[PDB]
Design a protein around this ligand. Structure first.
Ligand code: HEM
Length: 213
């Protein structure tokens, strides 16, 4: 069974759970506040920062390299733009770094530094979601918060170097499927993708609590 399939199958249950966190339920109904949107976007800033640091560290390592698509996919620069938009020119000292965000970053570093053959799980879990359901989430955010079609404040959701997310996502899958795979690696990769999903659920749980306090 192809890795791209193994991953989709292994994470379909947890994805349903992630969509139904209180925060994402509220987000999907169009109930997202500037305050809640800023918190999640600032948390993604840190998460993608760490993910992309580890991607760069491992760019030439054959357990990751077929997935090295910085120009098309990387989000740090977009998130920086969004932080300037939502937090102002001194955003770097204004943005929060929550404990659940710290926890996700810590695991990212563990993987990139000690278990790089698992880094595909983490890239799959964030980027493939961004290219599919993230585009739906984009449209809800825009409508909720009166964000302009010109894209300010939603740079994260915009892929100016990908013409067509569906076709790119098929390419990314195809390339995933060229990674050297043994039963060992495959089984652990799909386990780590479940953990990546859980780290996201735990973030959403935390942000909801911070918003309700
Ligand atoms: C309300 C929240 C969410 C909505 C409405 C949503 C919606 C979607 C939709 C419509 C797809 C396409 C499904 C398909 O093509 O069969 C998708 C795929 C994906 N989503 Fe999300 N999603 C949400 C949250 C998340 C979260 C929190 C994560 C991970 C952090 C995530 C990760 C992914 C991944 C990795 C895929 C690709 C599945 C694959 O094709 O292998 N999603 N989601």
């Amino acid at each position: 069974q192809d890795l791209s399939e193994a991953l989709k199958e292994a994470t379909k249950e947890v994805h349903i759970r992630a969509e139904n966190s209180e925060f994402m339920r509220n987000f999907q109904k169009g109930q997202v506040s500037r305050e809640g949107f800023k918190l999640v976007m600032a948390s993604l800033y840190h998460i993608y920062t760490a993910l992309e640091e580890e991607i760069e560290r491992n760019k030439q390592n054959p357990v990751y390299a077929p997935l090295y698509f910085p120009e098309e996919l990387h989000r740090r620069a977009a998130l920086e733009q969004d932080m300037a938009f939502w937090y102002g020119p001194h955003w770097q000292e204004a943005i929060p770094y929550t404990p659940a965000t710290q926890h996700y970053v810590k695991r990212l570093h563990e993987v990139g530094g000690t278990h790089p053959e698992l880094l595909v799980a983490h890239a799959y879990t964030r980027y493939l979601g961004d290219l599919s359901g993230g585009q739906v989430l984009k449209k809800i955010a825009q409508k909720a918060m009166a964000l302009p079609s010109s894209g300010e404040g939603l740079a994260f959701f915009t892929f100016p170097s990908i013409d067509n997310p569906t076709k790119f996502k098929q390419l990314y899958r195809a390339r995933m499927n060229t990674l050297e795979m043994t039963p060992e690696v495959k089984h652990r990769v799909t386990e780590e993708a479940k953990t990546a999903f859980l780290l996201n659920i735990e973030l959403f749980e935390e942000l909801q609590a911070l918003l309700t306090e």
